[PDB]
Amino acid sequence: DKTVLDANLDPLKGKTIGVIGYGNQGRVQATIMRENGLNVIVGNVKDKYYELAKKEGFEVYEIDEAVRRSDVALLLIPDEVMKEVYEKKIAPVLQGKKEFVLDFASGYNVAFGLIRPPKSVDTIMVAPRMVGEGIMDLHKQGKGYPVLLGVKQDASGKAWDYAKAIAKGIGAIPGGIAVISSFEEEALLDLMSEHTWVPILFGAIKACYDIAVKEYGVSPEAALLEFYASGELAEIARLIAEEGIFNQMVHHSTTSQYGTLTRMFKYYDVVRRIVENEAKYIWDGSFAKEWSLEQQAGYPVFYRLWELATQSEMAKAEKELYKLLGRK
Template sequence: MRARTYHDSDADLDVLTGRTVAVVGYGNQGCAQAQNLRDSRVRVVVGNRDDDYRARAVHDGFEVLGIDQAARAGRIVLLLIPDEVQAGVVAEQIAPGLGAGDTLVVASGYNLAFGLLDLPADVDVVMVAPRMIGEAVRDRYLRGAGYPCLVSVERDVTGTALATALAVARGIGATAAGAIESSAREEAALDLFSEQAIWPTVFAVLQASYEVLADAGFSDEAILDEMYLSGEPAEVFARISEMGLLEQLRVHSRTSQYGQLLHLERSAELVGTLRDRFARILRGEILSGRFAAEWSAPGADTESRIRALLDRAGTHPLIAAERAVRARG
């Protein structure tokens, strides 16, 4: 299935003329997006609680208001605070300040996809979701390079929601490389799938590899360097991004190419097992809403849950070996 891609020529920055954009949250994304919009000659105010991020926004020359004040001041409100606090902050501080015809912009589809935001019925709701950390969003804007970004219209009351979303995307530099038409459901599902299927499997592969190699009598230093401490995997992923999965094999030795391709063919059973597991995660945990209901349950102590999981993960011998190797320098 193909998706439409929007470029600078599809987006009109004049759509934002005379409309104040309130950037709520001056963290990783908020800092970058606020500065990019300002450099695109958009009127920006920042809404933030009284913390170090607020002080940073003041230092960077922005008018900084309380979150509730920013929501009232902005005709377009960018919601750039963590997923797990959005529902409460929106209900208590943002929704009451939104007026008819205003636009709420999310950078993560999570809370919209799982119905966790209680919003007035007379506001537009769109998504502009950079697929880059904030530092890269800022750096690539300054270089005019662009970066991957997903955009969607989740509710169009005014009939101009798409134009507003694309104007915001252009203002933060996303359409320079092409912003892809998507949905909050798609963005959230893909993000959660990477976090719950792909990366845990990578962790498990490293754990199993360490166990096998350590049992064979190889040193922790050599094993960890081979697996990831050398930084080689990052180089491989960079080449995959630049060249493609198979094309990047050309920069490996012939021995490496033969071994990788041979055992790829011999991994058909493993691929089938992973496909079944991943399908259960996608459908049974993510799309069903089961994970969202567990993670976003009212009053859930997210910090203690994460700490307990980290403590259990930290008991694997790979983690002890890594700490020892790092300590030895």
């Protein structure tokens, strides 16, 4: 298979590594690889995070100054402001560099060409598949966790080895796994979830509520308990994560099993259509354009939709209810 379970750690030994950004991923991975025996500096703009970063024992300079001292840089910052940070501060210093390894956690800005590093650089990806908080919950146990790897540009014949070395340094392998993939195959996946089954789920729940209340005379206080105000969803999700998606359904009643299976096979093509459309929209580079242009215009649609959703009937009722259950 394409699965890597463990690999060597030598190429990073002797070099210095700069961790750009000290958010969730930055903090965690920085700490872990400081623990695995590697000299690390941190680069950040001076605010709260800078205080905490220098508190935890890391020597900190400005971003560009950190890029100069480093043979490897990890850009662990949001994808929404990385472009400007790169053009302003990193790209010049980088033109003033020799043999550089550039690692990312997301492939959005590179897959779609918004960041185009030079040829003297090894361009790689090491993408976790976690919230970021739970990686420490799993690290103290000595457990690994999964990651995706990719190489966009190789000028050293060793980029894959550097990728695996990083994968080990961050503490994902051994114990977890590491899949080799592309920048594209990562952005595509990350976006497909956000565009296909999450919103469909939310809309279906909303529609169930609306229909039940406005057509069958149900009370708002009752529909919410059944549809999402109860913790049935998280339970089912846990059983999925642990026992398996279909095997999870054994613990339910046969009536439920039958209805679920029948209707799953009944409405399958309908959603496959949607998924096809959205995946095609992404692969072509259209959504990136949409999103960049909305940023430039001032986020009007974003604003209006946030207002509509929060000022909906279901949300008002949920507010009253949570106010009543005591849940904050």
